[PDB]
Design a protein around this motif. Sequence first.
Motif: not given
Lengths: 145, 146, 68, 160, 160, 160, 160, 161, 161, 161, 161
Positions: A1-15, F1-2, F97-105, F92-94
């Motif tokens: 999770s959160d890596e597919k969005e990172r890849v997709v947003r880089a795709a938009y920037r490149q294209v 996270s980090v 976790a040190g990074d906001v990644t769980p909050i984002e997800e 509190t999870y974030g």
Amino acid sequence: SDEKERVVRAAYRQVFERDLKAYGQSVSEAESKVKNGEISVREFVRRLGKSELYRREFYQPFINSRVLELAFKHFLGRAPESRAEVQKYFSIISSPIVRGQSSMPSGGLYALIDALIDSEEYTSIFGEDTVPYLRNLGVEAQPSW
Amino acid sequence: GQRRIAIVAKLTENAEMIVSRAANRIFVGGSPMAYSERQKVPPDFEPINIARYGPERMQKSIRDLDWFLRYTTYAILAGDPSILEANCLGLREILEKSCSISATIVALLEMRKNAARLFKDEADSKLVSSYISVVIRALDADRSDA
Amino acid sequence: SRYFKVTACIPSLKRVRTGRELQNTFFTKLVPYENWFTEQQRIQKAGGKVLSVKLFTGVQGANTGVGA
Amino acid sequence: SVLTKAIVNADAEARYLSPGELDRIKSFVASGERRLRIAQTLTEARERIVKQAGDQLFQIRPDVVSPGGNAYGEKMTALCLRDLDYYLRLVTYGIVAGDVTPIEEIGIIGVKEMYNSLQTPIPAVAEGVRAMKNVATSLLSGDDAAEAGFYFDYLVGAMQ
Amino acid sequence: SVLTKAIVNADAEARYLSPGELDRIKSFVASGERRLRIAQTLTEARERIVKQAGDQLFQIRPDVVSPGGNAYGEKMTALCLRDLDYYLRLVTYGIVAGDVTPIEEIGIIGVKEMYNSLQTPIPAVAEGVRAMKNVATSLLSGDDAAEAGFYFDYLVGAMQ
Amino acid sequence: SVLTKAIVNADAEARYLSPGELDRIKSFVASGERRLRIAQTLTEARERIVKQAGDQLFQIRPDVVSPGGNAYGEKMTALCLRDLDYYLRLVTYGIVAGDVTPIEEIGIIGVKEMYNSLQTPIPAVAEGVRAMKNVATSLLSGDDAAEAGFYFDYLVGAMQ
Amino acid sequence: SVVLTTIMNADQQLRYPSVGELEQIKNFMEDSALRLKVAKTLSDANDRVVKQASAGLFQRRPDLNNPGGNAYGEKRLGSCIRDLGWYYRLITYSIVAGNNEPVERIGLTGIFEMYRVLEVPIPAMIESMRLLKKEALELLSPAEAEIAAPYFDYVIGAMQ
Amino acid sequence: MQDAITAVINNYDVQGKYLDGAALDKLKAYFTTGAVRVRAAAVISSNATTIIKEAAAKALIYSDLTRPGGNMYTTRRYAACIRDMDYFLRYATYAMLAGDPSILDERVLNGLKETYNSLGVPIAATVGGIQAMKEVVGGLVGPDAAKEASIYFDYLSSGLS
Amino acid sequence: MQDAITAVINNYDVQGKYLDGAALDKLKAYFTTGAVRVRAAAVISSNATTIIKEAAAKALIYSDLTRPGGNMYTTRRYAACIRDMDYFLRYATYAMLAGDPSILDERVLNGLKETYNSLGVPIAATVGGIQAMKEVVGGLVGPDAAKEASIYFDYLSSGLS
Amino acid sequence: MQDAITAVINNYDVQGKYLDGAALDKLKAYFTTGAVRVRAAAVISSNATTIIKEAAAKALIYSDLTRPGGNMYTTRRYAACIRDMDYFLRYATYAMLAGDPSILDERVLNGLKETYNSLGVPIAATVGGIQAMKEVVGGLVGPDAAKEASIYFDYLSSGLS
Amino acid sequence: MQDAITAVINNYDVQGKYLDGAALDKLKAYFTTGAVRVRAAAVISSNATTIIKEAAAKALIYSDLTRPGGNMYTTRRYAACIRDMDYFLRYATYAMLAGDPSILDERVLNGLKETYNSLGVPIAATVGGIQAMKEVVGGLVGPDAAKEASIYFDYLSSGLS
Ligand SMILES: *[C@H](C)[C@H]1/C(=C/c2[nH]c(/C=C3N=C(/C=C4\NC(=O)C(CC)=C4C)C(C)=C\3CCC(=O)O)c(CCC(=O)O)c2C)NC(=O)[C@@H]1C
Ligand SMILES: *[C@H](C)[C@H]1/C(=C/c2[nH]c(/C=C3N=C(/C=C4\NC(=O)C(CC)=C4C)C(C)=C\3CCC(=O)O)c(CCC(=O)O)c2C)NC(=O)[C@@H]1C
Ligand SMILES: *[C@H](C)[C@H]1/C(=C/c2[nH]c(/C=C3N=C(/C=C4\NC(=O)C(CC)=C4C)C(C)=C\3CCC(=O)O)c(CCC(=O)O)c2C)NC(=O)[C@@H]1C
Ligand SMILES: *[C@H](C)[C@H]1/C(=C/c2[nH]c(/C=C3N=C(/C=C4\NC(=O)C(CC)=C4C)C(C)=C\3CCC(=O)O)c(CCC(=O)O)c2C)NC(=O)[C@@H]1C
Ligand SMILES: *[C@H](C)[C@H]1/C(=C/c2[nH]c(/C=C3N=C(/C=C4\NC(=O)C(CC)=C4C)C(C)=C\3CCC(=O)O)c(CCC(=O)O)c2C)NC(=O)[C@@H]1C
Ligand SMILES: *[C@H](C)[C@H]1/C(=C/c2[nH]c(/C=C3N=C(/C=C4\NC(=O)C(CC)=C4C)C(C)=C\3CCC(=O)O)c(CCC(=O)O)c2C)NC(=O)[C@@H]1C
Ligand SMILES: *[C@H](C)[C@H]1/C(=C/c2[nH]c(/C=C3N=C(/C=C4\NC(=O)C(CC)=C4C)C(C)=C\3CCC(=O)O)c(CCC(=O)O)c2C)NC(=O)[C@@H]1C
Ligand SMILES: *[C@H](C)[C@H]1/C(=C/c2[nH]c(/C=C3N=C(/C=C4\NC(=O)C(CC)=C4C)C(C)=C\3CCC(=O)O)c(CCC(=O)O)c2C)NC(=O)[C@@H]1C
Ligand SMILES: CCC1=C(C)/C(=C/C2=NC(=C\c3[nH]c(/C=C4\NC(=O)[C@H](C)[C@H]4CC)c(C)c3CCC(=O)O)/C(CCC(=O)O)=C2C)NC1=O
């Protein structure tokens, strides 16, 4: 999770040369499947190229001979390097039907983007998973001509 | 920060002695640091300062050690040894026609150990040792490099 | 309009690439009919083999509905 | 418009216009005077439509004109009515054009970002647009009412 | 057809159909009965149009029905008339369809490669299609003549 | 996270973990004790902070507790308080976790579609989060409250 | 082989062989009768040329058979001589082949990468291949030397 | 995708005869539908998000799906499900206007169950949501084409479940 | 892929033997006949389109395959099959020039049988077209390279079937 | 791009010098202020949308720019202006973290004045918006990093104007 | 890129004439000078690296280019040489195999001055390095083949400067 969005947003920037999420546009239909497992990054980039968003942005305001030079920077991370290359890609763009094998959904921008994406160079550098990136001075050997 | 600044200052304050020990250990047949322009493994098969090498080779020999010491302080102020390894990655191919690679590696080892002698090993003695070890590690092999 | 669902492996035997070459040596991806021939030729040119091809999207009758 | 859309697609595929595209162009040019009459009616009724849409929007969501509301105050409500007039003008432009290229290029692309910038309720603005749709269809015949209103729900769907 | 094109365009844009897109459907369904009548007329007169088209083609391009030319034998002439009948059937399909994608997906894509493999004169086939269009105009009304001539000229342009 | 972001960046760079990249790891393992203490200090008052943020939010936005608002009714008010507890658990999870990644997800991606489908004020939710930040900052010490407010303001910017 | 190289270009460009390409494909075979005995003479020296090359290279570079040397010891010398035999065999395979194919495809593309973890001196291998090239022509006549010198030049031109 | 006219054209073209009275009547059926489909589609597009909200409220909201330990829980997964619901509504409207359900098998049902099995999406909850969806949409557009919409909705439900 | 020379080279390199009398005999047997291969390849390249014409005329066209209902209906399918025919002819010429069927095994048969099965292509009709091409090519080239082309044509036909 | 440390090290390398007391004292000054820049950057990152919020509300909107005929009229231009304003804020944050304007010169300032001249963007209005976020950032960060933040915004404004 | 053979044909084609005595004399001269070129190409190869090292020692090294500040002061700047060179070899070995400037103007010497001006890279130094390799290749290649190699090297140096 959160890596597919990172890849997709880089795709938009490149294209498109910048993220379209700031404006609020997106190719929602082809966006899901690349996250989703059906089509690779190469297919996602091809759908982005032949999408209406790219046609309105980098095909309408420009000449065909300028559309070639912009597509080279967008789908290959480099500029056209020879006069013979420009003739080949312009003759690919200019004709109503070129066809490759069998089918004929190959007009202008659609045929050119297929030719660019199916090239030997693309599937040797940015093959099948990697969003294309600028091959400037740091990355590769720089031509001087 | 300030630790790194003090560490590089301590190297700069007596960099001459650090080069001096290595030069005197690997060069026999005279005084190597008379040739320095600042004054102006079977380890050693000791080159003679006038017979085997000569003055033009001697000046390069004395210069490159001080250059190595300077780049160590450079990387010390920097975050990583990138400036070092990018410059010693392909160096032995250039050197080896007129280089005793085994002679130079023992000089680098003496330089590292002497630099460790200066500090109290809080983190400083390990830092300079690790940075100078990068040069030797990226230098030796002759085939993993370049 | 139909996409073939295939799987294949393609080894690179002239450059020995040194980063993340595991996602590029075996893949399943939907490829359109109009691009499937040029894509499948690339695997044979590189030297890999295709393991399976599945029509997936459409019917074998064709005629109307072929265009897209 | 329809002409721009057909010509753009033909140019993108690098071919002359298809017979279906020519037929749609013929139908669009045939419906031109009817579209112009609908737009003229809406333009002449621009102020009553805006006022009634304002009353409907405030009745449905009086909270927006509450202290914790985006349009709290007479000047904020005037700004809301001005945005309402803007969207009515865009609807008339779309009606004369026969498509949504001008409406899209003028008032939806980035509208989410702008209204998030202004902290304004997008569903509330959509509610106001629907109130406009009701007030406008109240002044038109059935086919013309459907024609204007279906642009109105294009705006509502776009603001979503 | 028009429905397929509109649905495909809206689907590609990831949105419901645009105001031109819906009205293009309403006009097409309004024109459907006259489309069916024109198709009924062409299908009923399908043999006479083919015969007169063949007569005009062989009177305007005698080289095909000369020695060589791929239309010398009686069987070759029968095959040419069969091809004319096939293109008439494709035109009748396209007229009721409302667009030309069913024709393009059946008998327009690959025609150049196939006819080059057979060495049949593609300009000769275009002349035959022109003769068929003239016969249809002779055997049809005026507005139906224009409506069918759009698809006939599409076939002529595609064979080019 | 980090650790995940550092390893992902290094692997995208196609190299080992950078000496600087491991520095964030060392800093995290150093500050883990303090962040765990702050996390327990936040978790010891989950309902009290939700309470006080409740008074702040209701007093600041009578819109939400208005007849046109979404908090009108004890049931949906309880639902709003449950959402506030959810977001406190996320923050509190974030923090742990040190990074906001769980909050984002967990709670900011698609949260706009969430509260638009639910027809709820995003600015009201942001005001509630800010009141929660104020209560938490009063409940903790200033130096750790700086990082806690960093997480809270990242959430506030995310829902906006 | 020459045929492999030509067919590679032809299939890459999707075309038959060219009019200047068959002129080279035929000229590759007409000298095959002469060239067959050329590699045959080198073939029937295979365990002698490398054996005499060992004393020619290890005497030149005396640090390859010393305490600080990579080939120190009998079994370590044996590996270097076996490598010389391997490269001699590959160069004979190429001289009975045509283009660089047998050597480049098998034991040339990535010698740097092999020695990357193997620690065997490329500049020493340069003189080894130089010596092999120098000690293998004398068995041939100058007419065969002209058909032998370039075939040995490629190894010391590639590793460089 | 093949609409009604394209489907009839293909059906008589593989056989290879000109269209006759039977084809004329079959095409006349869709022609005498008379844009009731386009009015219903316009209404559904006008109030699309309301349909999704009501269907979700009477399908999954205030239940175990929207509490911890669910496929619906968390904003990302809920956004994915609601986007899928909008997909179902839009493709249902597309097929309803076309007259043929070929599009639903083309890209709305092909591999959808396999993907759901791979992911973890509860099929029954989605099916029941679609079941309430045809009811709400039929209440909206009216009884003229409510049955026509319900047939495509039932086709999608049968394919999914 | 491999030809006669490369096949001999790597077949000896696998066990690390120098080129012996049998190996040089195989190479000489290849080199003594390849000039006829060059002439046959030139003739085939000069007469490629006519070969595909007569193979289609005597094996595929004038049949129910080209009639409405067959695989060879519509100009699109006609052009696709003739392109396949051209590809088969060119790869057969490459195999004949190389003197080894590795080129056919890699760039021809790989991913073709199951693809034809998934597309509904008639394998029997394809094999008949291949034999028609072989007949025309044998008629054109003459006794010198007729069997040389025919062996690889039979290789392709047997690989397909 | 370059920062304080990289600029100093390259400036002494180009000469060929050891890092002397003056260089170590400049690194003294950079390192002693480090944590203030980090907390300022964290505050800016946490409050980025609100800084643009007040900056736009105080400098751009409610003027002739947003009315028809203005540059920032229409949703497209409004979104573009806010994205630009965010670009300026983020690159000012990068410059503040690095302690050098080289990144701003390299990746923002070049092509910017020429692009704005090409598109008709009001450079005076852009400078006003940058000053607006400078005031807002000075309010948010406080005494510790106010000047250090404001210097790079002033550099950007001076480079544009 | 053009050789003598292609150059004569291109020159005689724009004016639409058959190859006359002068063209046959030029082609005859190239064909007579076609063996020394091939031999000297192989001589330049193999001994390429020692040629570059000797040229570098003769011209580049032992100057300001190696001291602090030079454009070959450190390695990787030294490494961009040997590279940079190996071109000016490679090319012009191509030139004295397909003898005509052409290739030297189209691939190597075209915008090289612009690239060097944008990257530093002393042009006078890199021309002295070219003349050093000219001397070393004239020494290695032979008496008669020292010329035309001197011609192409002089063309490269003159064009660069
Ligand atoms: C080495 C101990 C053994 C061995 C290995 C070997 N591997 C290949 C080829 C490939 N190896 C990989 C590996 C990876 N892809 C990934 O994504 C990862 C993790 C991120 C790995 C480890 C792949 C994909 C290939 C194929 C593509 C390529 O060649 O780069 C070969 C070459 C095979 C060939 O010639 O085609 C070999 C030899 N061989 C041994 O003898 C050891 C037991
Ligand atoms: C009214 C029904 C709703 C509402 C609106 C509201 N808007 C503003 C402020 C602005 N609105 C715009 C709008 C546009 N600019 C464009 O280019 C277009 C496209 C034609 C539009 C629609 C702009 C630019 C502004 C900023 C001010 C200006 O125009 O100069 C406000 C004020 C916000 C504030 O003061 O912070 C409000 C309240 N509010 C509601 O409650 C309704 C749902
Ligand atoms: C007649 C006006 C012209 C002409 C025609 C001609 N055609 C053929 C042979 C064939 N024609 C077709 C046609 C089609 N196949 C399709 O799928 C479609 C789309 C519906 C068409 C139109 C085919 C398949 C054939 C091959 C034979 C077969 O049908 O099985 C010939 C015979 C050529 C030969 O060499 O035998 C001819 C002569 N010739 C003219 O001169 C006119 C211009
Ligand atoms: C409270 C400050 C605001 C508010 C909220 C409100 N929420 C609901 C209903 C729901 N909220 C959620 C939330 C989440 N699901 C998740 O996965 C997450 C991430 C952890 C969250 C935050 C859900 C799922 C629901 C639906 C019911 C359920 O949970 O099963 C309502 C009720 C709406 C209704 O129509 O009944 C309300 C009112 N209201 C306000 O006024 C505040 C701004
Ligand atoms: C909704 C009623 C139910 C539900 C759905 C759900 N789906 C996902 C994730 C995905 N959904 C898709 C779907 C498609 N992509 C397409 O292109 C098509 C064809 C038009 C479909 C059907 C895919 C591939 C994904 C993965 C990528 C993505 O998230 O978009 C989720 C989230 C799963 C996750 O976290 O990865 C959910 C929740 N879940 C339920 O419980 C509902 C009953
Ligand atoms: C021709 C004699 C027969 C025939 C063939 C036919 N083929 C297709 C489609 C394809 N054929 C191929 C073929 C190849 N791919 C390869 O790599 C090679 C060797 C290098 C071959 C021969 C492929 C990939 C396709 C699909 C992609 C494409 O066509 O571009 C069709 C079309 C099927 C359809 O309509 O869906 C046909 C008809 N048909 C006959 O009647 C003959 C027996
Ligand atoms: C906003 C406060 C002002 C304003 C701006 C405005 N900008 C554009 C368009 C573009 N702006 C950029 C900017 C950048 N690209 C970069 O990479 C960087 C540095 C990293 C910057 C600063 C670019 C490239 C464009 C053009 C492409 C695009 O639109 O993304 C517009 C739109 C102009 C138009 O409609 O064509 C606007 C309006 N306008 C104002 O009135 C403010 C003063
Ligand atoms: C060496 C004798 C001199 C010297 C050179 C030097 N060059 C670079 C960098 C580049 N040189 C090139 C050259 C070419 N590219 C081409 O395509 C061709 C012709 C085919 C040439 C000649 C280019 C493009 C670069 C930049 C990219 C790259 O490095 O490949 C450097 C490096 C400069 C830097 O540090 O950035 C140097 C030092 N330096 C000397 O002192 C000599 C005078
Ligand atoms: C900071 C890292 C670094 C170094 C050290 C470096 C070295 C370096 N040494 C060189 C030469 C040389 N260096 C030496 C000698 C020696 N070299 C040594 O490190 C020994 C102390 C000594 C042998 C005992 C000699 C003799 C030459 C002349 C070239 C030759 O050997 O032929 C050259 C070629 C240019 C010149 O002649 O000055 C470089 C670039 N560059 C770098 O980026």
